[PDB]
């Protein structure tokens, strides 16, 4: 037991605020509703990372550009890594205009409410998992800078 | 305001206390720590379900055998399915004496607490979420029958 | 029996000869050895093939380029296609700096010598074989143009 | 000037005494229509390897039994192993009920004739580009034992 509590279901206002009480620092797309989180570029791989909110699901997901010449063998490693992590998840985002993208992702179910310590253990443990992964991809030169 | 829930760091037997609470019927392995779901059979492809508890974090887990003729061919697709949920993952588990396996899971944090209610949530999201994903796979004719 | 023949190991001067025979012609690279063949780019999703001749083994090559979205797929379906040609063989050839190439060829064994007659239907059964593979990829929305 | 050889459009009964020719035994299936090569069972991996006629082109196969924990990263180094070769061929056959099998072939076109010098030298480089793709995926540990 760890006491009563009582639940909010957060909008994405609710989560500005709770990531300012935690100092984390947020950025936003003119181009989207995602929270960018600047500070997850510090591991080498990541291009950009974010918080999204969605149908009653807050996401954490962080996206790498990945070489085309590890494109294959990546995409023959995505079982391993999605069973390397309890939380995270992995998979490859492939255009015929741009650079595939290893996108690393959490989602904690927010639509039967949190609270505030629900959420920051999951920035911080997603943070954990997201960047394990990403800096594995990157020690093992699968992406690009 | 709405009224307050008790914060729970849950055990297995927390658990079973839960999934009684919400009627759901669960059974044992001699063989493993995990929950038993008989009521996931009723989806077409599903081998077992189950709930574990690891190191703080509840999966809900599916599994179903995959036919050899689609194993390369779903390895192929596990991005797009892993990009069609939300919540769920999707991975394969492939060894060399059983037929290869799709886990098909979501997960709880349970580390910082867990209310009642919010279990209630992840089993019937997990649910609906897991069973689209293995009832898709089963009619795309990729999986052998229980 | 088809008689009593004499046969020739070719160099790359006996086959510009042959193909001059056949009425096929070829063009030929500043930084290659390879005799290219600009009919070859009549068929959809060619952007170029060539003869090269290498320790003794002539081959006959065409080159694609495949869309990235298609690249997983078609690396997927690679055993298929080399397993639908008793002569044809498929590969991939990816590059950091281009675009994803699909490589169909057919070789012809030459050191223990060659009829100008087996040259021709290696020619004809190659162009056949190469040019319903790289069709086929192309129907199929796999290549670029 | 050189000697002259004889061309031949060959059938099965060519091969075999061509084979006989150069002292290399071959078996049969009552079960197929290839003519088996037992020596070809001493480089490790090969569970079987055969001459076959196709529509006039010669096959020369070796066939390896596949590690079902290997398949996928065998899958994704074909390109490679395609490439590795100015003649061989390697590719899957994966069915429901075996074990999956890498193939590993060269062909030699018949149908405008062939020469006996011709086919000696197919067996002799067939066999060495053959073996060395086997030994290595072997080397790989990507195979099962015969």
């Given at each position: 037991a760890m006491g009563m509590v009582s639940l909010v279901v957060p909008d994405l206002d609710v989560l500005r605020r709770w990531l300012d009480?935690?100092?984390?620092?947020?950025?936003?797309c003119d181009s989207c509703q995602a929270l960018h989180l600047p500070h997850m570029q510090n591991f080498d791989g990541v291009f950009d990372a974010?918080?999204?909110?969605?149908?009653?699901?807050?996401?954490f997901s962080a996206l790498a550009e990945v070489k085309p010449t590890?494109?294959?063998?990546?995409?023959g490693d995505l079982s391993q890594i999605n069973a390397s992590s309890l939380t995270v998840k992995a998979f490859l985002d492939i255009q015929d205009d741009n650079?595939?993208?290893?996108?690393?992702?959490?989602?904690?179910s927010a639509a039967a409410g949190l609270t505030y310590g629900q959420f920051?253990?999951?920035?911080?443990?997603?943070?954990?998992?997201?960047?394990?992964?990403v800096m594995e991809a990157?020690?093992?030169?699968?992406?690009?800078?």
């Open positions: 009480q935690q100092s984390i620092t947020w950025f936003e974010k918080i999204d909110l969605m149908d009653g699901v807050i996401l590890a494109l294959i063998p990546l995409a650079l595939p993208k290893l996108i690393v992702c959490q989602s904690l920051v253990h999951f920035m911080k443990e997603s943070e954990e998992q997201i960047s394990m992964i990157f020690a093992n030169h699968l992406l690009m800078i």
